[PDB]
UniProtKB/Swiss-Prot annotation, chains A, B:
It is a multi-pass membrane protein. Residues 3-36 are cytoplasmic. Plays a role in the formation and maintenance of double membrane vesicles (DMVs) replication organelles. DMVs are formed by nsp3 and nsp4, while nsp6 zippers ER membranes and connects to lipid droplets. The chain holds residues 3064 to 3113 of 7096 of the full protein. This is Non-structural protein 4. It comes from Severe acute respiratory syndrome coronavirus 2 (2019-nCoV).
Length: 50, 50
């Protein structure tokens, strides 16, 4: 993490959350074909959390 | 110690105590098979010191 903070300057904070949200969304999309509940409830939770 | 402080940035302080506590716990676990008193009293002392 120190090495990561060495680069990317000030924008590392913006990059980290953007990567984490993308990874979470990718996992949710991967779990979609079996659990049909996710697309709505996860979107609602995401809207609440944003 | 100066060379160590050169790296790890701000988190060297967190790393040092974490390593020291792990080493102390490892020593206590190593002394366990003969001195059966240690698991309780050392845990109490650790809770007090934390």
């Amino acid at each position: 993490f120190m090495r990561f903070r060495r680069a990317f300057g000030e924008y590392s904070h913006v990059v980290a959350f953007n990567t984490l949200l993308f990874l979470m969304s990718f996992t949710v999309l991967c779990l979609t074909p079996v659990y049909s509940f996710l697309p709505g409830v996860y979107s609602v939770i995401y809207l609440y959390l944003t």
